[model samples]
Target chain A: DSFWEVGNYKRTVKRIDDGHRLCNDLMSCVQERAKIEKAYAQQLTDWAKRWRQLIEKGPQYGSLERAWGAMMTEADKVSELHQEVKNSLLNEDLEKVKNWQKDAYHKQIMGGFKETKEAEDGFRKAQKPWAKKMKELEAAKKAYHLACKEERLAMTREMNSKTEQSVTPEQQKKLVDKVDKCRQDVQKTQEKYEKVLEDVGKTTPQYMEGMEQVFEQCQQFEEKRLVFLKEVLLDIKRHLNLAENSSYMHVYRELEQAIRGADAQEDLRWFRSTSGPGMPMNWPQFEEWNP
Target chain B: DSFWEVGNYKRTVKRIDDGHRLCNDLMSCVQERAKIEKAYAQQLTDWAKRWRQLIEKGPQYGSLERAWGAMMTEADKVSELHQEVKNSLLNEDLEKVKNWQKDAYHKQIMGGFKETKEAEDGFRKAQKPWAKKMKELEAAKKAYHLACKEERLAMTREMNSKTEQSVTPEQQKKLVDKVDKCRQDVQKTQEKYEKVLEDVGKTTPQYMEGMEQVFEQCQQFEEKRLVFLKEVLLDIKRHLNLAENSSYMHVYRELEQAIRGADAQEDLRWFRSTSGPGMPMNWPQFEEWNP
Candidate 1:
């Protein structure tokens, strides 16, 4: 039944494919996550920077100095974090995996295929003459055996049919000569077959070793790529946390003050509090005020 | 002695310019205050509208929606209040003062100058003949007294003389006639002077009445202008309160949310919270996030 299996692959995998497939499947996931991370990072950074600029550049918003600076700092941190994660995903970590795929995988795994193929071909070609000789020897021995049987059958027929004794001395000598030649052929084919098998054994061991080395390197690549993938995900989360923990609530608190009349009154009152009634300020009240 | 005499003028005169010199001095105060009010009103309105636009028009700051709207409403209130105060100062209240200066002040005050001048000149001209007659009567009486004194002395000298006893009745009669003639001239001049004084009385009263009417109307203008001035100051305070109690703080509070990652996250998180895991979303975590 389909269910939660969060760590199943990581835990159960004894071969490269087991863990490697998980890493491969997650390649796009990491990419997509990084994309989001980058987008938000840029947005938040740009927003923070723009606000700071608006505050700094605009005469009207000068009152926001302290808070805007505080917010800008937080946004910058998130921006830096996401950018770093993006670089690792698309740059450092993936670069390492790519290098391994090109260099180590090519040399070890693909080279191993060539080695195994050469060994198989070498063994097949080397054993061909030996097997042909064995086939020729078998035919000669069959002919010799047939000749002997035929001679025996003829002797029996002469005895049983009163047709007179078949002249079997010459024929029997020729068949015996053929049997001797077949035994020589069988001995030579056996020696050739043993030599070819010995040569095949020597080369096959080297090929198997190459195959083993290829498997190990492939496992190595997957293991490293898997590590890289996990790192990238964690990095994205870490970057995202910066935005979450710091700036999310910062600017809101400042805006909350805009509606507070008491605060504005306090500000104005406090500012004017120090002014005492004295000589005429000589301040003009109304003339061209048009109001 | 130079100590503040703030309320003394108002108390003593029991009229508008009574202490109203100070109020008159503060004319520019209202105009200046209105200027500041308008500046603040524009700032708050523009800020609120811009923030709302930033929230609504752009996809970037969606977290600011509710806060932005709240801030915009408060800003509108402030804008309306300031604008009202401005209209009162420049449009309704002060405009009334200006018209009073032009029309009522002209009729009562400036017009009074012209009225008083005409009355003074007319009264002076009307009394001129009476003054001339009295001077002529005084000169005639002086000559008659001299003639009587000369006759009396002549009689005394004749009585003391040896041949002086007689027929001096002729000279005495002539002197008597001269004295009688001077007396008649003095009586006629006195009657004419009295008649001229009566005519002066009639014209002088009219002139005084013109002066009094001018004074009263000028006082009336000051009283009305003072009322308008006081109302304008109060209205300014009212508009200032709206900005202080509502818009300034409201917009500031809305802006404060600019740096709140928490708001953004909460927005996203709530949307996802109700979404239970089902079939694989099969969605790439990133490419373009409509979110």
Candidate 2:
């Protein structure tokens, strides 16, 4: 009816151990994810740098040039945003799980749970008296059985003496007395075995309850671990929810504005007016010869 | 009052040359921009791949795991969109500009414009008759001035001979004849110069008109170039407008749905039910002896 069963207590310990590993896995997973974000941000930064340089050195001009440069600027901003994400994953989300794992699941040197050991020891301590009573009950039952066997052998010997006519009256009385003594011993040992069994039966529930209480402690630990893991997962979800990220949205908004502000006609007109073809030209005229 | 002036025709040619350079700059700029997009997309793909593998092999389970993996999938989708953007920029936008440049501006081996040479030759051809008239007018005027100078020198020598009594009647008569011949020469040369001047004056307007016509052609070509460039700029704007991209928006929407579907409570509960502590356990009981 409970995890306090003789064969079932170890399972709860294993569950707690599994929870520790779960925490470690989450931490490692997020750590690797952070690495990916960091690499992506670095790549973005490099991309922006290379293109921005190319834009400046190239022949793009006016609004078109500005818009092109703005794209690179947007890339830089995006890179910064991703870098912040990486930092949050490492310093905030991963750190929280790491610290929670450290505090929640204490482990031994060989990777076994200290919590498991403590819980197991507590359950064993709670069951010790019941185990002792059961052992006594078993011994009493064995004694009763042995006494019964002796009484049956004595009775057979007395019967045999009567049939064969080889035994004297004194031997027959002695066999009869042995049979009586064996019956008394059998009765005494049987009562003692019954008494021990009754005592064990009476204490069994209390022993089970005490072991269950110890097991419940492990269950409470597991529940808390689950709850903490849930919180960590929710936190991770928050970190990854870029759609709701205002700063990220702001970056896009700025990029949109930059792109919107690019007036192709204006840029083309500007180029036309500034370039050679658009300048005023002097026409051919009659030259007067002056003396 | 036109670009066909003797000293101004080169400006038109230079303008056409600038247009070619402008086309090249635009092509190069977009090509670089495409490179940036390609690099960004490649990085995003790598980011998605690396994180997706990590998420798969990690211990994350249930909704949280799926949501995390969904994020990587979204990244992949976004990368694909960027890759498409790169392709459009290079193959569509850049190609359009490059083809337009090739058709619009025909350059010689030295990078000067064939269009400019043709236009200049046309202007020169139109001005050839007027130029011949002006050359003859200049020569006739020079001859008339020289004849007047000789006539004045002869008249002064004849007067000196009458005052100093140092010349005979024959010498004085010779000086007077020389003055008469010089006067005739001056009148003849003056008339010829006036006639050439009249011819040049009559043809000046026609020369100016022809030159203006040639310049107008150049202007038309430049206007077409500007219009084409404007179209190119608009196309570039379209390519860079990620906010309007349906695929990009779809990626975000899918990611949002995945993140929203990630129920921390459900995942936690699932972990609880499947894990060790949530499993039913058997309680300890007294074993009946059956000897």
Candidate 3:
């Protein structure tokens, strides 16, 4: 018989498209405990028989020992806890029952709970970082928005200047080309954010990785953009007055170190001490006491 | 072109179990790397295109003041690494080139050394107990032999007594019955030690809850022997001529606890106090201590 009284439930083949299935799975697990309880007496008899034979027979049991070793090493003990539960229920031997129960609870079950709680608490305790990532995400969205708007207004100003100076066919062609390029730029901007929204929260590690991928791709495609949007892409690239195309080289290197320690600490120090932009990176400059 | 040169090799459609042709597989992976590298370039161009649009569109990048918040979330990280790896190779960065060699060595090639070392250590560490197990095995075998020899001697003594009336027929019958019972006991002891020998290296939590399972098992089984086989298995049970069953449960429990925690202070003190014969569990004046 199944553990969960599955025969009592009605089933629909179609997906419910909700979290009801997760609830059922949790319920099913609880029911398995009851199933184990129902079988407890017979299971003990079976175990006792096996236990007797196990201590009596000549079979190799080194594998089970290895499993035990793994438990101790990883602190994932509780594989044999079902027996402790059963022993408490059935055994009248007071000393045996209490000693086994206390040891099992103190050394195994509580250890896991304490460890997990500590890790979660540590995450919540970090003052600067836990909130830092969320704040950065918002700021980046805004920066990208402002940068695009600046590029567009610059394009419009150039068009108006050209119109006022002359009405040549070439000027008209240049204006048409510039606006078309601006539209392409907007499309690419939208795509980047769309990718971000799609991938974020999938998993912490995965979302971070996905974001990194786009940044790297954007960096590489800088040179290649000239080939795609005819003369317009080139003009837009030129007008931005960005640091040499290779300025991303510094950011890219910092990103590498951050991947290891989740911070660009080393990279920032290197840039600050050397012939860098003296830009002080993302943080405010440390105050130096003037003599 | 592949990053690494493949050895000259060729193959037609091959059967399963032929394993992989390393040259071909490596060449294929390099091709994939090149495609990823190209995408890295395209990704940057894409970002620039977006930057231009964001400037022209409704929302613009606020200012360079927003660099920290807007651009440097963790996703920006993964993209950064992916591009860095590609760019490093593209630009012939020698340090990364050297690191890649180490990575390949650790991950793809010659990586089994650690696992092999760990298994070797486990086996080596088990040697001391395994040696003890062997001794126990030999002792059981010898005890079995002595039992067999004792039974034979009793059989000879019985026949001689019966034929010659040197003692009495009643005495001879007792000897014969004793030998019969001796055989059963020798079987049990032999079986126990044999089981233990088979389980010598096994340190499973299920097989024995605490440390030193074999030692605990040996002690418990011996106590059972001391209780049940006063006349049959033990040589002194006959001389004592006691009809009541002996209880060595107290000594057994104390010994089990001591062996379980070989370093336990209390168990050590209790074990030191337990001398040989006739010291029952109630010797302790404290009622709670006795239990």
Best by lDDT: 2
Candidate 3 to truth, TM: 0.18
Query: Each predicted model: what fraction of the native A–B Cα contacts (within 8 Å) does it retain?
Result: 0.00, 0.09, 0.00
Tens-digit lDDT track for model 1 on A160-216? 432444356553454344545455554554454455445544554453344334433
DockQ of 2: 0.13
- The two-chain DockQ for each candidate, comma-separated, is 0.01, 0.13, 0.01
Candidate 3 chain B weakest ten by summed lDDT: B8-17
Q: Write the per-residue lDDT of candidate 3 for residues B1-291, one digit (tens) a residue.
A: 110001101110110001122222222322344344445334434443443444334221122112211222211332344355455433443332234333322332554333233333333343445445546666765666666566655667556655756465455556556766776866676676557555644532222232123223322432332222121112211111111122222322332332233222332223223321112332111111111
Q: Candidate 1's residue-wise lDDT over B1-291, tens digit each? A: 100111111111232222233333334444554564565467556655665564455332223244324435555664676677666666655554455444432234543433334433443443345445435444544444444454445555544533544355655454335545554654564464445445544554443444344334433444454444444434433332333344444433433343222243443333223221111222111111121
After superposition, the stretches of candidate 3 with alpha carbons farther than 4 Å from their true spots are A1-291, B1-34, B40-85, B89-176, B179-291
Can you write out model 2's per-residue Cα lDDT over B188-286, one digit (the tens) per residue? Answer: 878887787777667777876777687668767866765666556666656765655666657767765776676656655664455433546443233
What docking class should model 3 receive? Answer: incorrect
Instruction: Give the candidate number with the greatest DockQ.
Output: 2
Candidate 2 stretches greater than 4 Å from native: A1-35, A38-291, B1-70, B83-215, B218-242, B245-291
lDDT of 1 at B20: 31
Q: In CAPRI terms, where does candidate 2 land?
A: incorrect
Model 2 chain A: which ten-residue window has the lowest total lDDT?
Answer: A282-291
Give a tens-digit lDDT track for model 2, residues A183-227: 898888788887887787788778767866876686578667656
